[PDB]
Design a binder for this molecule. Structure first.
Ligand SMILES: O=C(N[C@@H]1[C@@H](OP(=O)(O)O)[C@H](OP(=O)(O)O)[C@H](OP(=O)(O)O)[C@H](OP(=O)(O)O)[C@H]1OP(=O)(O)O)C(F)(F)P(=O)(O)O
Length: 167
């Protein structure tokens, strides 16, 4: 349902999510993608027209997707989905090359993400996507591998800005 919010500049879809950390900050909560059952990502979703701030969207999506309750302790700023469009696959032009580097052909981001760090206060056995997804705690190293395996570097950037212990 086209009830979603878009950047008036880049036309990118506005999304908010949470890097949910344990009190000791050794672990982060990850959910499984709905589409790709074996891919581990973090809670996030489209801002809706009613929502007065990114924090609202973020805490709602952390409930709906992960049955997680906690307090936002930090704004992790923005990261972007810079994945090229679908039609890119079989186009005549695909890359733009410099004398000292190579890059993908210029395009607007799919998604603009506003991330917060949440400290987990409770996890509930029942939530709206109870049976549609799985959820579990992971150390930094496992989370990092999960997000590379999911092909979501931008979610790893958001994770890297968090106070999660990397040691
Ligand atoms: O399908 C896409 N993105 C969808 C998200 O998939 P992932 O972010 O997991 O890759 C999905 O997230 P989950 O269902 O796995 O949780 C949810 O994105 P969102 O939760 O960040 O909004 C959904 O949105 P909805 O289906 O509307 O909930 C998004 O696709 P669209 O938002 O429909 O474009 C894509 F970007 F077009 P693609 O390149 O992955 O094909």
């Amino acid at each position: 349902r086209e009830n979603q919010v878009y950047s008036p500049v880049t036309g990118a879809r506005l999304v908010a999510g949470c890097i949910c950390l344990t009190p000791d900050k050794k672990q982060v909560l990850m959910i499984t993608s709905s589409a790709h059952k074996k891919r581990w990502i973090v809670p996030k979703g489209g801002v809706e027209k009613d929502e007065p701030n990114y924090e609202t969207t973020a805490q709602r999506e952390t409930w709906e997707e992960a049955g997680c309750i906690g307090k936002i302790v930090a704004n992790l700023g923005t990261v972007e989905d810079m994945r090229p469009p679908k039609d890119w696959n079989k186009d005549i032009k695909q890359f733009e090359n410099s004398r000292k580097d190579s890059e993908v052909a210029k395009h607007p981001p799919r998604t603009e993400f506003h991330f917060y760090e949440l400290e987990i206060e409770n996890l509930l056995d029942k939530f709206p996507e109870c049976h549609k997804r799985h959820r579990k705690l992971y150390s930094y190293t496992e989370a990092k591998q999960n997000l590379i395996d999911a092909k979501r570097p931008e979610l790893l950037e958001a994770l890297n800005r968090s106070a999660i212990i990397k040691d």
